[PDB]
Each structure stands twice: as C-alpha cells, then as structure tokens.
Amino acid sequence: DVGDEYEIIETIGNGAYGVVSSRRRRLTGQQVAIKKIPNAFDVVTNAKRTLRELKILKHFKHDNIIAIKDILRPTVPYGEFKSVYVVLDLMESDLHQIIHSSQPLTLEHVRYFLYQLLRGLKYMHSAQVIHRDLKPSNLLVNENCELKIGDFGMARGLCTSPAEHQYFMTEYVATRWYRAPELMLSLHEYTQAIDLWSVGCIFGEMLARRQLFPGKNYVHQLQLIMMVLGTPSPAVIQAVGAERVRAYIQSLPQPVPWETVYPGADRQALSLLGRMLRFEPSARISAAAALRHPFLAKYHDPDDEPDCAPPFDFAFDREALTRERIKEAIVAEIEDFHARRE
Ligand SMILES: CN(C)Cc1cccc(Nc2ncc(Cl)c(-c3csc(C(=O)NN4CCOCC4)c3)n2)c1
C-alpha cells in the first residue's frame, strides 16, 4: 500500500471511495495521513473530481488549508494503475467531533476556530475558488486548536455557464444543512459569498453546539431557513430558478432577531453572525471584512492574512475529457508534484 517509506498506524475512515489511515514516514518520523483512492479512474466524474482536488491542493500553500506532502508514484504499468495514494497533513480530529462531543468548546475556542476558518477562506477566495461544501466534518483540527480546511471536491470558481442546471440537481446527503440559499434556490449568483453562508451556519453551530438549519428534506430545509430569516424578499423570489419553488414560497404567509435565536450570546459574535446569514449574497460580509470585525480583534493581523496569487484556473476542469485523458492528467500531476520537492 504505502511502499517502504511509510508505516501504517490506524485507520481514520473507510466509507466512500477512499480509505484514510494515519502513518509515519520511516526516515523522518513525521506523522501524516495516507488517503487511498481506489478505482480512481473508473467513474469519469470521480476522476474529474480527483484531478480537481489534486490541482486545488497543489495550488494552495496556506497554514489553514490541508497540504499534500506526498503522492505515491505509480508502482504498476500505466494501464494497471488503479489506486492513488495521497499523503496529507495529519490532524487529530474534526470540528464536528469537537462540537458534538464531551470536550470543552468555550467562546474563545469558537473565536479562534472562526478566525482560522476565515483566514483560510480569505486566501482561498482571493484565488477565485469557492469551496461550496463547507461543514464541521470538513474542518480538521488538532490538539493546539489549529484548523485546516480540506476536501474541495465541490469547489468550482467564479464562472458558471449554463452549468447552473448542474447545481439544480446534484446529490447532497446531509449536506443541504449548510447549502447557501443561492444554491437551494438556484439564484444564478454563484460567488465566494456562498461559502460565507456556510460559515455563518458553522458559526452558530459552535455557539449553541447544535446545527442551526437541520432540514430533514429539501422543503424542510427551506422552511427552517425561512422560520428564522423571515419571508424572502420580492427580488429573491423572482430570481428563483425553478418556478415550482417560487410558487411554493409565494403560497407562504418576519426575521427573528439573532439575540432571540441565540439568547445570551456574545454581542460581537452575533454581530458577525448577522453579517453572515442573509438571503442576498451581495448582503453578506466578505472573508476579508469579517477578519476585521470586532469579534476577532484578539487575532486580527493584516500582515499575516495573505491573499493568494495567481488565481486558480478551472479551464482544465471545464473541458470534457475522456477517462483516459483525465487519468493521464492525474499521473502528470503526481510526477509534477515530485518535480517540486518531495
Ligand atoms: C485520530 N482519529 C481517531 C481521529 C480523527 C478523526 C477524523 C479525522 C482525523 N484527522 C485527519 N487527518 C488528516 C486527514 Cl486527510 C483526515 C481526513 C478526514 S476525512 C478525509 C477524506 O478525504 N474523506 N473522507 C470521506 C470518506 O473517505 C475518507 C474520509 C481525510 N483526517 C482524525
């Protein structure tokens, strides 16, 4: 599995099309995570997502974004190469376990976690990359309370051709809980503000240590969102993609203050929260401006919240590539990685 240069420790996850084990580099002793992606070239959409992920990760160099530390070279003939091994930063837990466990989660924990999330997000949005699928299970953390953003299978970027119908109908299992309203309602406004909606959801979830908008189904999700944010505005309703969603929403009979949603919460925390959770994307705060909000004064540092240049190009992802060309690009990605340190 891991060749001679690593040693396996324990399995961290096995479901889905990947195994995640913790390991140690034999020569250095550094601990890492090894992700096996089996049958990585069978399902064109899977291989596309994988190539997407490898490129996004190789592009980012940022302490709050998981880094690729090694990619195992193909140990079998090209045509026989079917399992991809990606070595990543080993983290100790994820924000979900923290929120839904027996461990401390003080307002200072919440403040520092939010700070690192928004710092990663500032660097990431400056590269024209939208994560689109943020959630506590996607935020990795260690003992010191350091946070790293991961995954990225769902990241897309700023251009949205009439591939908005693609967003119309896609699979989201338990993942509509943080899905931005513009995606729930296909408002055809797909920018980095998407992520900010989720951040708000995550923020409140740290505050009360319970999910904010836990819809049991699509319609229930919309109903929950509305019971708090109040009836959406005329313009929003008119921008909804599917006439049927519009009709249901119009066939419905006010916003509840956030001090009432989270009675007794840090004033500044709820200030930021309210700046995040709004229907109109344009009305949300940017990651950059959030980092300057009073709630984060403890950690704000303008010389240590860098943008990322150059921006990230999704052209490779936009073109329809055969299975073969996708596999070719992934192998080229591995070799390129080994061409930029090891
Ligand atoms: C030590 N342990 C008992 C506690 C624990 C619990 C959860 C996480 C971690 N740390 C960690 N460090 C590095 C990485 Cl990279 C990951 C990781 C999580 S999820 C994932 C992925 O890519 N996909 N997931 C979806 C389905 O397939 C595989 C998983 C990669 N986690 C530690």
Numbering used by the authors: 50 to 302, 305 to 393
Quoted from the paper:
Currently, the abnormal activation of RAS-RAF-MEK1/2-ERK1/2 signaling cascade has been confirmed in more than 33% of tumors, and it is considered one of the most important drivers of malignant progression, invasion, and metastasis of tumors.
Additionally, the morpholinyl and 3-((dimethylamino)methyl)phenyl group are oriented towards the solvent regions on either side, respectively. Structural analysis revealed that the SKLB-D18 in complex with ERK1/2 establishes a more extensive interaction network compared to its binding with ERK5, as evidenced by (1) additional hydrogen bonds at the binding interface, (2) enhanced hydrophobic complementarity, and (3) optimized electrostatic interactions.
